[PDB]
Amino acid sequence: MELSFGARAELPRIHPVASKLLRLMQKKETNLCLSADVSLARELLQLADALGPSICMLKTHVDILNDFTLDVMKELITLAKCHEFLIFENRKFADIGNTVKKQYEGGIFKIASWADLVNAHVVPGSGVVKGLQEVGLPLHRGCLLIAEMSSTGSLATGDYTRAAVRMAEEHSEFVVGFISGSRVSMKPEFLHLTPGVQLEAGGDNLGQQYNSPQEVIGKRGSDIIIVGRGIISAADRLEAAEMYRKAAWEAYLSRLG
Amino acid sequence: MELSFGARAELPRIHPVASKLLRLMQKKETNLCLSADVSLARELLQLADALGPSICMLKTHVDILNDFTLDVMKELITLAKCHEFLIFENRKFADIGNTVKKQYEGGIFKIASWADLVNAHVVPGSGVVKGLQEVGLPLHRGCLLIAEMSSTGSLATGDYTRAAVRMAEEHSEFVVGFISGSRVSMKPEFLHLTPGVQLEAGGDNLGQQYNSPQEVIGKRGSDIIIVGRGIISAADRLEAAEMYRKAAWEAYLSRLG
Ligand SMILES: O=c1cc(CO)n([C@@H]2O[C@H](COP(=O)(O)O)[C@@H](O)[C@H]2O)c(=O)[nH]1
Ligand SMILES: O=c1cc(CO)n([C@@H]2O[C@H](COP(=O)(O)O)[C@@H](O)[C@H]2O)c(=O)[nH]1
């Protein structure tokens, strides 16, 4: 039946990036992804260093960093290697393949040079994956497909979600999992990462909706929680991260039995 | 029945950005949007200057510019004002409102400071529009919603397309039209902009599919053609732009009768 993260890391069809992730999740007893939604490089780096031991992944929006430089990403990579977490740039590539390939490799951000993982919306059809793959496969990177969204009015439901799952399963050499609210693939080689997570019930004023780690990992069968404001707006971000880590980890263990 | 671009510019419910666009389209006899998919600021600017008289709009992907600076955008604005065209950043905002508001205003690109128009995918629900509006309305900007896509396997069909149209029509203070393959709204106050356009039949190797200006403007009832490689890969980009302009303009006139 259900396998531990450590065993999933060894599955025949596992992607190397997924394997690296699954192994460090097991080693560190963390299935928490920090959503580092900050505008200052110094804050990003100080969070990455202090919280690194508590997280399996740090999710970036590099396009909201007021003082982005590639040197900032070099320093982030140093922390990622030191503390053992992956870097996930939440770029949401969402256009024709020819365009996304350039967006992934080029420009000022050079996302493919530092990001272990990126994500894509599936709305354009499988060309979005094919374009990204042309850059990501040579660079030994992975991709997540957005199969469901956390926000009110999300159209990523029903046949749309099914299409995302098929697209992932048909591009397993590059696609390693999903942004989703629940387990959407029955194949254990794929990771499920779930945003819209806080300990307390609520939402924001712009359509975000929250569920708890126990709900999303335990009841809905996801693997990793993505948490932004629940941690970032807290006074003690380290303690907050530990609370989220312990919640997500125990929900995982209990579901494993 | 059908109104000229000039008359549409005066409609009671017209958005000011739409009005400005419609008036310059009529004045200049152009419903061509150049997709300036280049990596060099100098090429971007030289295209903008030479082709400015032939276009109603210049569409950017600032994240593929290797030498982006805000000064480049200042120079682009100077050309836009001189030649009378709008600047459209094809950012495809596609996340929860709280995130997109920061992506629109902030970061290195400060998109809202220079872009007349941006676009958004509707997959997250109407929060994507609400978040963007919080920045764009004060700055007197407009937004386009992606109702259909040109690429093979597009999921922007059926109820998804209907949802995009409703979302636009319910946020008319900020949303001024669509990226689509055809007329999708029956309300003349909304613009339809159509990518996937070349004179010759064909596609690319990454899921792009082409139709002609006569097909998309004439038969499918769209307003503006978005053209990248058909112009940019041509030797004489000025002549190419003129060919596309004259095609799209005559298709418009004939449909007007
Ligand atoms: O459906 C989604 C998809 C994404 C992409 O990961 N996100 C992102 O997770 C994070 C949630 O942050 P929060 O915990 O502060 O709401 C944000 O960066 C948001 O853009 C969501 O919140 N919901
Ligand atoms: O459905 C879409 C949506 C977009 C967003 O505008 N686009 C964009 O139009 C342009 C088409 O370029 P081409 O004429 O070279 O194919 C590209 O920048 C591509 O990213 C499309 O090609 N199709």
From Swiss-Prot, chains A, B:
Protein name from the UniProt record: Uridine 5'-monophosphate synthase
BP terms from Gene Ontology: 'de novo' pyrimidine nucleobase biosynthetic process; 'de novo' UMP biosynthetic process; pyrimidine nucleobase biosynthetic process; UDP biosynthetic process; UMP biosynthetic process
Source organism per UniProt: Homo sapiens
Superkingdom of origin: Eukaryota
This protein's UniProt keywords: Acetylation, Decarboxylase, Disease variant, Glycosyltransferase, Lyase, Multifunctional enzyme, Phosphoprotein, Pyrimidine biosynthesis, Transferase
Function, as annotated: Bifunctional enzyme catalyzing the last two steps of de novo pyrimidine biosynthesis, orotate phosphoribosyltransferase (OPRT), which converts orotate to orotidine-5'-monophosphate (OMP), and orotidine-5'-monophosphate decarboxylase (ODC), the terminal enzymatic reaction that decarboxylates OMP to uridine monophosphate (UMP).
Family affiliation: In the N-terminal section; belongs to the purine/pyrimidine phosphoribosyltransferase family.
Metabolic or biological pathway, per its Swiss-Prot or TrEMBL entry: Pyrimidine metabolism; UMP biosynthesis via de novo pathway; UMP from orotate: step 1/2; Pyrimidine metabolism; UMP biosynthesis via de novo pathway; UMP from orotate: step 2/2
Record's catalysed reaction(s): orotidine 5'-phosphate + diphosphate = orotate + 5-phospho-alpha-D-ribose 1-diphosphate; orotidine 5'-phosphate + H(+) = UMP + CO2
A GO CC annotation given for this chain: cytosol
Region (OMPdecase) residue spans: 2-257
Active site as annotated: 90, 92, 95
Keyword Phosphoprotein: yes
Binding sites annotated in the UniProt record for UMP: 35, 37, 59-61, 95, 99, 150, 208-210, 228-229
The keyword Acetylation is assigned to this record: yes
EC number of this enzyme: 2.4.2.10, 4.1.1.23
Binding site for orotidine 5'-phosphate: 35, 59, 92, 95, 99, 150, 208-210, 228-229
Disorder cited: Orotic aciduria 1: A disorder of pyrimidine metabolism resulting in megaloblastic anemia and orotic acid crystalluria that is frequently associated with some degree of physical and intellectual disability. A minority of cases have additional features, particularly congenital malformations and immune deficiencies.
Gene Ontology MF annotations: identical protein binding; orotate phosphoribosyltransferase activity; orotidine-5'-phosphate decarboxylase activity
Full-sequence portion shown in this chain: 224 to 479 of 480
Subunit structure: Homodimer; dimerization is required for enzymatic activity.
Name of the gene encoding the protein in the UniProt record: UMPS
